[PDB]
Amino acid sequence: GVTLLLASQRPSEISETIFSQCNTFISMRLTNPDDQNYVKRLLPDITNLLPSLKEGEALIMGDSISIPSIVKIEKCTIPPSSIDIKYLDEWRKEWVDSEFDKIIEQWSKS
Amino acid sequence: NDINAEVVSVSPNKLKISVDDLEEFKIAEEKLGVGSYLRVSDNQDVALLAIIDNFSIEVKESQKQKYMIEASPIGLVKNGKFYRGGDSLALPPKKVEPAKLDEIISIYSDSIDINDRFTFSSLSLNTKVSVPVNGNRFFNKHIAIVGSTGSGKSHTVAKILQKAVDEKQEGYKGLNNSHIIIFDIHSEYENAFPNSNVLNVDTLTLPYWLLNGDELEELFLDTEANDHNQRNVFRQAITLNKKIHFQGDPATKEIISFHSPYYFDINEVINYINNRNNERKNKDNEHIWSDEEGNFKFDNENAHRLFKENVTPDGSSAGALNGKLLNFVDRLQSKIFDKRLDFILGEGSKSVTFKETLETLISYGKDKSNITILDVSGVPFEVLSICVSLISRLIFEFGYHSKKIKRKSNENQDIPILIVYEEAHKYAPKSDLSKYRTSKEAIERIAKEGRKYGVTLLLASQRPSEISETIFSQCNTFISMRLTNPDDQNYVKRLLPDTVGDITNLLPSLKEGEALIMGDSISIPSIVKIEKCTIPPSSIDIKYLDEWRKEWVDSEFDKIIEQWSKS
Amino acid sequence: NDINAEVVSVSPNKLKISVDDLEEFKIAEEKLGVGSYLRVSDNQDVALLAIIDNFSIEVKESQKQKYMIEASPIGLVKNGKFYRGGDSLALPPKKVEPAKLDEIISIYSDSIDINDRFTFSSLSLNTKVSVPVNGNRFFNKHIAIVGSTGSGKSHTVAKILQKAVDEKQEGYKGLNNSHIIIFDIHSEYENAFPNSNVLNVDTLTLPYWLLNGDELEELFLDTEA
Amino acid sequence: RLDFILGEGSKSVTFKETLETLISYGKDKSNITILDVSGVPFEVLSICVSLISRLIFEFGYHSKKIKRKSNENQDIPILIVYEEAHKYAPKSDLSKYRTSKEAIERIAKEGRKYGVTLLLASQRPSEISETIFSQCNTFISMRLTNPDDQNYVKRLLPDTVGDITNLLPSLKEGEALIMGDSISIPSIVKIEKCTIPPSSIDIKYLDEWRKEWVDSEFDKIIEQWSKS
Numbered sequence A: 001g002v003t004l005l006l007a008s009q010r011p012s013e014i015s016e017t018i019f020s021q022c023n024t025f026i027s028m029r030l031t032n033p034d035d036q037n038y039v040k041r042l043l044p045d046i047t048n049l050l051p052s053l054k055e056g057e058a059l060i061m062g063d064s065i066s067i068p069s070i071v072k073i074e075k076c077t078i079p080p081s082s083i084d085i086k087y088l089d090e091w092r093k094e095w096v097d098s099e100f101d102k103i104i105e106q107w108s109k110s
Numbered sequence B: 001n002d003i004n005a006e007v008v009s010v011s012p013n014k015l016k017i018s019v020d021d022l023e024e025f026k027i028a029e030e031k032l033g034v035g036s037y038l039r040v041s042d043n044q045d046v047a048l049l050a051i052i053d054n055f056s057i058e059v060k061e062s063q064k065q066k067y068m069i070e071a072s073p074i075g076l077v078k079n080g081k082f083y084r085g086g087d088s089l090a091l092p093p094k095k096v097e098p099a100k101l102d103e104i105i106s107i108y109s110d111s112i113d114i115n116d117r118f119t120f121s122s123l124s125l126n127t128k129v130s131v132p133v134n135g136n137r138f139f140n141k142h143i144a145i146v147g148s149t150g151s152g153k154s155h156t157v158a159k160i161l162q163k164a165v166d167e168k169q170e171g172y173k174g175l176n177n178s179h180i181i182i183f184d185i186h187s188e189y190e191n192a193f194p195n196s197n198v199l200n201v202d203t204l205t206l207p208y209w210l211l212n213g214d215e216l217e218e219l220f221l222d223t224e225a226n227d228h229n230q231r232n233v234f235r236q237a238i239t240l241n242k243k244i245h246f247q248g249d250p251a252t253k254e255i256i257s258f259h260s261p262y263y264f265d266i267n268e269v270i271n272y273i274n275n276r277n278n279e280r281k282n283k284d285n286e287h288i289w290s291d292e293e294g295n296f297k298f299d300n301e302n303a304h305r306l307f308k309e310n311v312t313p314d315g316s317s318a319g320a321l322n323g324k325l326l327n328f329v330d331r332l333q334s335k336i337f338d339k340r341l342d343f344i345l346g347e348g349s350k351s352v353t354f355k356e357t358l359e360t361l362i363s364y365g366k367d368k369s370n371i372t373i374l375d376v377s378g379v380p381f382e383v384l385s386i387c388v389s390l391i392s393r394l395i396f397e398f399g400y401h402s403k404k405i406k407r408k409s410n411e412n413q414d415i416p417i418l419i420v421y422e423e424a425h426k427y428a429p430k431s432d433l434s435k436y437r438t439s440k441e442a443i444e445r446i447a448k449e450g451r452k453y454g455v456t457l458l459l460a461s462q463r464p465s466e467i468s469e470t471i472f473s474q475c476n477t478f479i480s481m482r483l484t485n486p487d488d489q490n491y492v493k494r495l496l497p498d499t500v501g502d503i504t505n506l507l508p509s510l511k512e513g514e515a516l517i518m519g520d521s522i523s524i525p526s527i528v529k530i531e532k533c534t535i536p537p538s539s540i541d542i543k544y545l546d547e548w549r550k551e552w553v554d555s556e557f558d559k560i561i562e563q564w565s566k567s
Numbered sequence C: 001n002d003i004n005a006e007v008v009s010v011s012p013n014k015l016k017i018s019v020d021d022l023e024e025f026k027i028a029e030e031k032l033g034v035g036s037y038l039r040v041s042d043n044q045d046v047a048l049l050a051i052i053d054n055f056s057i058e059v060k061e062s063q064k065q066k067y068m069i070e071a072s073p074i075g076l077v078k079n080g081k082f083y084r085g086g087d088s089l090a091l092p093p094k095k096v097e098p099a100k101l102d103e104i105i106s107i108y109s110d111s112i113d114i115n116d117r118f119t120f121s122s123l124s125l126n127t128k129v130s131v132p133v134n135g136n137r138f139f140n141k142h143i144a145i146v147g148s149t150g151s152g153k154s155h156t157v158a159k160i161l162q163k164a165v166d167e168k169q170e171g172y173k174g175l176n177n178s179h180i181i182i183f184d185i186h187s188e189y190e191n192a193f194p195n196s197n198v199l200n201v202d203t204l205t206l207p208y209w210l211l212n213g214d215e216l217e218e219l220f221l222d223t224e225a
Numbered sequence D: 001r002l003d004f005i006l007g008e009g010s011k012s013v014t015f016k017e018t019l020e021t022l023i024s025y026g027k028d029k030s031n032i033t034i035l036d037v038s039g040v041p042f043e044v045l046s047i048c049v050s051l052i053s054r055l056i057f058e059f060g061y062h063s064k065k066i067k068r069k070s071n072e073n074q075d076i077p078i079l080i081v082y083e084e085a086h087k088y089a090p091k092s093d094l095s096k097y098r099t100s101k102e103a104i105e106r107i108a109k110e111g112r113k114y115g116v117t118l119l120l121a122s123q124r125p126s127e128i129s130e131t132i133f134s135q136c137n138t139f140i141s142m143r144l145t146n147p148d149d150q151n152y153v154k155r156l157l158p159d160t161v162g163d164i165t166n167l168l169p170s171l172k173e174g175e176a177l178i179m180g181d182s183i184s185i186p187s188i189v190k191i192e193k194c195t196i197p198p199s200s201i202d203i204k205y206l207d208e209w210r211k212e213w214v215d216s217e218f219d220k221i222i223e224q225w226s227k228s
């Protein structure tokens, strides 16, 4: 009763012994052909749409699904706290006078 | 008319187009090249647009000229609005014209908002259209600028950073918020950025006590030896030496450990280890010494007395670490005594402060600048991996700790920091050798985790094929100036998402200064011309011909020898 | 006419040239080699300069000789000034002749300024074409001369250094400011530079105390035990 | 054999005339200093190469200290020529050549800004370490004949030529292939013929073997060996 969810990024660097034991496979957009070829090999030609996948789309394969298909994962109404930093919009403002006292206190703490 | 071309066959992502007449020859010269744009429709309101991948102009004896154009549909234009996507299908035949200036403008001006556009280049085939990128997505996802020597890589790097500095929100005057750090080995960005803070070996003081646990044992210990008694005596010396120099609250003093960023003096650390090469236990198994104040037993309270050299061992048997640390000590003072490491292990590191190192690294001191150029020309190459890893980790954990302050206040990470890695293959090679391991890991955490902490990369390397795959793939934005090595082109082709026909033969044949921008920052991967640097980079290289061409100098040689003796 | 060649196919970086008539055979041997330069134009003013990459000559009993030349457009010339270009289009058919001497010279001479030009070699397929290098940039960046034994790399090293020694600013008489140190191991560069300082074992005095700790260990210790 | 490094002369020589010897700034000036290291024993050859290569580098390192203090236009550029660079700077990390490896690799990495540049002339390029060979920018590739050296050079060349794989073993005598910053395009060149060629005094084994059995020379070898 102890299974695992392997939320990795690129399949080409994960240990073979764990990633071969996984059977249900969800592949999002994968821009590295080395990553694509590992996902292609697991299938017994839908992998050619892996790099052109839109944001949020996925390819689910395994015995859990009937056919390996490109799916759109449901949007998170309560999303995880993963906020992208707007580099341009932050850089447009004034030079913000940030005091270094409070930051290096906790850096020294841990 | 001037051009009579139509689509003869379509594919899922390929249009084959036959040019039938070609009355006007300058249509073929600039509007029918590889990477140009074609309008594919039967009307003048709804159309597809297509990049040109390949062409072939066959001519023979009696039959007609066979001009065939291979194109890929990049998107859809409806009533002056461009919509990306190859899903829309053109049923052949469809009349093909070169795209007008307004359609090519609408390609790049529709996918990006009016406030998210970052323009630093124009299209190479059409100068009148500028090519903006999504500057949030340009800089949040890491940038890789590759190319051969003389292709204009540093000019492209400089021109991006000037446009990052000169761009401002309206209603204010003065320095903007952008923070860019450059690792300058060839010393080129002084001439590009005159109004910026530059730090060379003679000026920059990097404290050695800010090195973490991994960096300290790489610089001092032997990874190949892997001696745990040498490892344990190093940590217990530095941890104790950080305690005796702390002047603060006792509760913070207990949490001080070997990785904690606190000041310790390396000369006393050598003295502690050198003394512990000469321990002599008594019959009760306790080490006994004698300084000027009297005999004492080596325990936790009196271990600070070994930091001074004037201690004499007093015992019968050999101590616990007697003779096990002599190769440790001789290499330990070999790096301290070296004059090349005065900026890192010298007397100047005693008088600097953890604040003063951060205030100097991102130019937050008395003189403030957006661009901090780290002239690591004079830095010796064996500590180049150490120094780059120290600064990169000092910016990443500043970027981490900046966010965790703002998560308490429920705010975003205020200042985003960019680090430019000129000649990035030296810090982060494909080779798994231990001499560049610490710089590989430091760029790894910025590449894979720094996106969420405000710390990013600009991997500007002449040889991308000597950068590791696990950091090159994290650079979503890719700029290709001119790549001529076959292994270099086969490397980038293996790390690039799609973009068939825009790299296969285009990269060797590119002009100086024009590049290939791609990623989620741009709407489509296009060959653009990076705009000229009015204030260009200029490395002050030794012009060997003119110095050899002149008279044999005689006054200089005497000054070189005596200055060597003086220092 | 001497040679009647013509472009029959155009690719983004590839050119197919059909040689229809070859009255002068000597153009084929010298000017239509593997690495030779062809100019591709319908006029003498503006031309597309292309290097050859491959060729094939077919003869059959009834048909005419099929001399095909496969070329690549390395650049472009305008009134004698060469521009290195990418995908500059030449619409077929275009008359092809061997490139003039002034055109091939302008590929190598125009990229380097006349003060920074350093010549130690000429083009293999055209001995009249001097090939200069940016001697400003030739020396400060490191040079790697590689070949097999008996390929002539000792001669190439010697010729470069002789060209770097006899050259001067012309405003003085005497020795220039070249400083070249050769780790001559085969005892061969004595002849190439007769007016040089040669240091063998009997003349060199290398102090042992200028050795560092790493060098001093190998001079005295044994490392096997 | 170690008299040049461990004799009575090495003690009395001071630091200044050592650099007057290696750079030829002594009594007789010379643009080219030829270091005949053939009679140097092979056990100490990497030691003497690394000693000189270090000494030239810190001469250029301390060259720049005056030029930032005095801001004078004059400068002393130095080029170092390493004939058979694959044995001074091998790919192997063995202890015997890491002194000469570290001296050359310091020049290959830091010597650009100090006026101490290097020329690598090796008949077996594949043994030279990639961290030194890639620091070079201009490559004069002569006739390369071993397939291992052909594959090594083709990777680290900054550019390529059409059909380079058959070009390298088919180069004629004096034919070269220059790529890099100095040249505009990779071109097949003919190096100028040396009027005063580099000639090594070689023993013509077959020529002396066909002569008569010499008799007088054997005794003069033994008596000098006996007396010295």
Ligand SMILES: Nc1ncnc2c1ncn2[C@@H]1O[C@H](COP(=O)(O)OP(=O)(O)O)[C@@H](O)[C@H]1O
Residues within 6 Å of the ligand: B147, B148, B149, B150, B151, B152, B153, B154, B155, B156, B512, B513, B514, B529, B530, B531, B532, B533, B537
């Ligand atoms: N946008 C441009 N337009 C025209 N010339 C350029 C441009 N960018 C660079 N160059 C030229 O290319 C040359 C090479 O500079 P650079 O690309 O910085 O070298 P590297 O690729 O080694 O960094 C420079 O001398 C510069 O004049």
Ligand SMILES: Nc1ncnc2c1ncn2[C@@H]1O[C@H](COP(=O)(O)OP(=O)(O)O)[C@@H](O)[C@H]1O
Residues within 6 Å of the ligand: C147, C148, C149, C150, C151, C152, C153, C154, C155, C156, D173, D174, D175, D190, D191, D192, D193, D194, D197
């Ligand atoms: N540029 C050249 N032109 C004509 N002959 C040459 C040229 N370079 C070398 N040679 C001849 O080829 C021979 C090869 O010698 P060299 O190339 O100097 O030896 P190595 O390559 O083994 O150092 C020499 O005897 C020389 O006469």
Ligand SMILES: [Mg+2]
Residues within 6 Å of the ligand: B153, B154, B186, B188
């Ligand atoms: Mg550069």
Ligand SMILES: [Mg+2]
Residues within 6 Å of the ligand: C153, C154, C186
């Ligand atoms: Mg030789």
